[PDB]
Design a protein around this ligand. Structure first.
Ligand SMILES: Nc1ncnc2c1ncn2[C@@H]1O[C@H](COP(=O)(O)O)[C@@H](O)[C@H]1O
Ligand SMILES: Nc1ncnc2c1ncn2[C@@H]1O[C@H](COP(=O)(O)O)[C@@H](O)[C@H]1O
Ligand SMILES: Nc1ncnc2c1ncn2[C@@H]1O[C@H](COP(=O)(O)O)[C@@H](O)[C@H]1O
Ligand SMILES: Nc1ncnc2c1ncn2[C@@H]1O[C@H](COP(=O)(O)O)[C@@H](O)[C@H]1O
Ligand SMILES: O=P(O)(O)OC[C@H]1O[C@](O)(CO)[C@@H](O)[C@@H]1O
Ligand SMILES: O=P(O)(O)OC[C@H]1O[C@](O)(CO)[C@@H](O)[C@@H]1O
Ligand SMILES: O=P(O)(O)OC[C@H]1O[C@](O)(CO)[C@@H](O)[C@@H]1O
Ligand SMILES: O=P(O)(O)OC[C@H]1O[C@](O)(CO)[C@@H](O)[C@@H]1O
Ligand SMILES: [Mn+2]
Ligand SMILES: [Mn+2]
Ligand SMILES: [Mn+2]
Ligand SMILES: [Mn+2]
Lengths: 337, 337, 337, 337
């Protein structure tokens, strides 16, 4: 904005979420929900860096603790999130990756908000200590009937706020809402998320493609062509550098920052893709969009899809708009009846 | 062994290292080195976790800017290492990537070990919260003359200890020395590395190849032919998964743990590979060979190469043994003249 | 309250402050202020445990850091609080122990709240590592004229919320408002204050008197008598155990928990007492009251005093109601013209 | 000394201890002991900071209650110490306050040093966030027979190392051994004790007496007469300040640093003082004498007392030297028959 004097400002998530809600002039039911997520993320971060790992390994004498088939990070995560969220008194339906059925919040603690989440993502690949994260999407209950599992089933286009928490070399909470995508970072010493990036928009074109090339054998022709074009470029420019961490949060996030494109196409084994719609694809699609990028299934678009199963998968391609445009055309070229 | 069922107790790094040096009646000058290097790691992890960022963003009101010097991470890291090193009174020649020349420790702090390190690998891939690390290789001075750069130029086969710390969703330290490879997890809550994996041995055969396929264009046939046999197996068996975090510590680490192979061979833009020998190549190689795998370059083994220059580069291929011998064969099948 | 089923609840300060404000049906200007204090307390706690002390002492090479006459805990504290508070956009006047004049917040950031505070209390006695704390009192600007220093000058009875943060063996934030006194405790691992005590009320009678007996020579007769009665009890019961930490927050807090009584009478040197009215006595008096205890100057009562100097001192006696009643009578007995 | 202006660099405990043992060619069995004991402290500090309380209050949803065993602090502490101790392979007889008998380390872990500790002094004064601590005194086994309780019964004069860790607004470790007393500050951020005060020597004469005047009734004349000379000095000089935190580590610590004296003499309810000799009295005494002060009991010196029982008690008077010799005189002036 235009002019003044001395302004040294430190925006903390809680402050932001607070201000933002007041402008919205909303009651604060959400703002509660938003803070409850904030706390889940920080406690999960602590679990993820294996704080207290010493007790499990005999510092306290190896009491009753043992690392193998006992306290797993997933369950704990799902426990926290569901707990910390019900007590927010703002949710009426929790749809989680780890929980088969849609959780319907007991009336005493009901709220007008549906929350779809993946407590710990890439959690398998924690043994290799690779970057995992938490993804979430929030919808507002637009029904009138008792909060049925159905209330989750809404196009991503209906999201009221979405985002993910990356537990990489440092912990980042990316939040996206109507007006923008903002990245807040955790300062562990004081347990606070500081706005380190405001109104994040993604590069028009990038120089990285992210895909598990090992499925080459089963990739569709349109994809095969796109990739070859990145490796061996026609006009003889620089080829695209490749990346594949193997963790959705890590790839989407790097795509959001350096640009480039991510893809997890349909292949026979998962002809509907591996990634889920409600709590993986959608929240990420939503962020890409608010950032100025594109999330497409290759033929249609992620957010316009209308779910029929809370656990339904979907292909997903998202990244810089210009790259994703390039791949969408190649799909057109090959598209037929 | 006499009587001890399924047992296991707390074992810190410090204690671990300590008894190891007792076992082989060392003067205790090296213990002081592993001791020091470790303190360095522990602290760097913390700088890497952007812990304390709050103050840096005005929460403390950057008066006229503040801090006890916390700038470019790789620069402060570089400092921190060289610092707790000289003060170990166990080093004579320190070689850093971030340093054009070799460092020759003044006579006061002058020890006897030559130490090579890459203070922060992935230093640029940092903005993405994508795992970074620290690599160090230790050499025993072998000469009579004044320590200098030449004392650093010894083939990897002459290493005495070698490891790397990986800053990811957890901070892990891997330490290999004559007996084997031992992984210590940093329990941040109490600031101590705990022994979680002792005597690590690698998978004879994994299901993952790792490489920047962005360079497929500049790939020598053997490589190019190998990648193919993984994507589309000749014997119509399940194809290899692919994973490229784009950070050596993370990929070398994933390959150590989960099995598989890692490739960073020569190309049109880098005839001798991109990876530096003394501080990236030999350490990973040493760990690898001590873990049970191989570390070839295509035709010769990493550890035998005799260094003509401290900042020398080299192509590298390391991983499971059955896997690295397959690519070697392919490399033999395509004999060069 | 009466009946239900399964209720496992974790109340975090932020949540509490949030809920409480909604019931109040207030806009949220305060709630902002309340959270801004919450963050100051946590950052100061970090400074108090000397986190990063290593950098000042050469880990980073003793860069430009030196411990003596450089970065002091007081100033830093006062810097944070004033900073973090102005940016709350909820304060128009800050009266601090460490700042001679009443700070008048620049219009861009003005709010309808006056905040009186002692950034670091007992800060002198930190060398002996003894318990220090932060005290604060909040008044609502009841004037109409430009926020003049005068706006601070209001009887403690006019406080809208008050409390203190103890940085003892563990960090506690005690908050008091119209409806009650609640103690929240910091879990450093996740940077969150959990309600560990709800609606704290103090014991009618105690068994500890807290006073610097070294001033015996100059104590008034009424005090001299009270003390002798604790030491040598008339009715031959158990004498009172004595305590004197030398830090107001530590004594007031232990008085609030185990009961007993605190005193810091007038003596010739400080015939008006040592403790200040606006940001030491008043906030503590206010807490004692809401807890069911009493804060008296010996003749009148702390909260009814009407200030004329923002830095004016005042005697103060506070603790269990029955003990403080006992001492008030003894003052009556001796009181005259 | 040769050339070094006003200089100072980072010095960790570990490094410090390490070189100390090198200097006096120890087998390194004791280094392993100071090493171990320290890890214990570091961890206890953390349990004492109630860090992790969140989960304990349902944030993680105490499923059917959880934890890696974190109960009564003094009980877990007691455990932790005895644990990292046996596993040091440096202890034969461990004596704990919380333990009715002496612990005799099994032959496998059986070392040679006898270790006496009070795992958590102030354990009850904890609810008030009032500083607590840990005290330990080390004895070298002197016998040929089977280690047992008698090996613990040696006068304080035969101690080899002694110290205490104080958990207050900071975690400090004080270590005294033949050469002197050295204070190490715990920098929690990186989990390492840093040398802040080397070779501490106490004030010949302080301005603070310390004692539970609640017991004035049961005070022996010399004491009673001494307290008077401080409150109302005969030579009409400034009176002594008084401070009684009601926790030995905090008061012994304040007295070490700021000067002054500390008294816990006999009385009607405790003819032999309340403080236990082996784990509270001798350590503080040793530190005191090594700091430059005295530690008398009234007529004989603490360190010479020969223990008839491990849980023996003793009155104690320690502090500045000129101060402790004044009370002694007074104690001589009131000769007992
Ligand atoms: N913290 C916030 N950030 C952005 N929008 C908000 C926020 N709080 C409330 N709103 C908007 O106003 C609506 C109503 O708020 P509520 O009464 O709390 O449910 C929310 O669904 C949002 O669309
Ligand atoms: N802590 C240790 N772990 C493994 N080998 C060690 C250790 N300490 C000493 N040694 C071996 O013994 C030699 C003598 O160590 P030093 O005298 O301490 O420099 C070293 O070069 C190592 O090869
Ligand atoms: N967090 C809160 N706790 C208690 N009372 C509050 C809170 N927030 C607002 N109130 C009450 O309502 C008044 C108006 O709130 P406000 O608009 O935010 O200034 C405040 O002065 C309080 O008296
Ligand atoms: N780290 C040390 N600091 C002070 N004295 C030590 C140290 N290590 C060994 N010593 C002395 O030397 C003796 C032999 O030590 P040790 O063989 O390790 O049990 C001990 O009893 C101590 O008196
Ligand atoms: O490409 P792969 O080998 O099938 O696995 C990748 C995907 O696994 C997941 O866990 C599926 O949800 C994602 O985090 C990730 O992007
Ligand atoms: O993007 P590229 O060109 O494939 O190289 C990535 C490489 O950079 C490095 O960080 C160099 O130190 C390697 O560890 C890493 O694998
Ligand atoms: O009793 P003394 O020796 O005067 O000092 C005590 C007082 O000092 C102070 O710093 C004065 O504000 C208080 O914290 C404390 O209660
Ligand atoms: O309240 P009292 O009776 O004066 O005793 C307090 C004493 O308790 C102890 O904690 C006993 O271990 C002492 O360290 C401390 O000074
Ligand atoms: Mn997932
Ligand atoms: Mn590198
Ligand atoms: Mn004060
Ligand atoms: Mn005790």
């Amino acid at each position: 904005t235009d002019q003044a004097a001395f302004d040294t400002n430190i925006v903390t998530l809680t402050r932001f979420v607070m201000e933002q809600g007041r402008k919205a002039r909303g009651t604060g039911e959400m703002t509660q929900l938003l803070n409850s997520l904030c706390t889940a993320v920080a406690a999960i971060s602590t679990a993820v860096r294996k704080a207290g790992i010493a007790h499990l390994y005999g510092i306290a004498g190896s009491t009753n603790v043992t690392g193998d088939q006992v306290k797993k990070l997933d369950v704990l995560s799902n426990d926290l999130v569901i707990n910390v969220l019900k007590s927010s008194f703002a949710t009426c339906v929790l749809v989680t990756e780890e929980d088969k059925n849609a959780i319907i919040v007991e009336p005493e603690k009901r709220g007008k908000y549906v929350v779809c989440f993946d407590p710990l993502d890439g959690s398998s690949n924690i043994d290799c200590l690779v970057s995992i994260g938490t993804i979430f999407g929030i919808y507002r209950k637009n029904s009138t009937d008792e909060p049925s599992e159905k209330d989750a089933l809404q196009p991503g286009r209906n999201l009221v706020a979405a985002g993910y928490a990356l537990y990489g070399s440092a912990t980042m909470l990316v939040l996206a809402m109507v007006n923008g995508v903002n990245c807040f970072m955790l300062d562990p010493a004081i347990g606070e998320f500081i706005l380190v990036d405001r109104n994040v928009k993604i590069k028009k074109k990038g120089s990285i493609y992210s895909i598990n090339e090992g499925y080459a054998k089963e990739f569709d022709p349109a994809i095969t062509e796109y990739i070859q074009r990145k490796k061996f470029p026609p006009d003889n420019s620089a080829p695209y550098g490749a990346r594949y961490v193997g963790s959705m949060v890590a790839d989407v996030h790097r795509t959001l920052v350096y640009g480039g494109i991510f893809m997890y196409p349909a292949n026979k084994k998962s002809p509907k893709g591996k990634l889920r719609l409600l709590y993986e694809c959608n929240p990420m699609a939503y962020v890409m969009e608010k950032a100025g990028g594109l999330a497409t299934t290759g033929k249609e678009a992620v957010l316009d899809i209308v779910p029929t199963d809370i656990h339904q998968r979907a292909p997903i391609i998202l990244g810089s708009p210009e790259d994703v445009t390039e791949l969408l055309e190649i799909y057109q070229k090959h598209a037929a009846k």
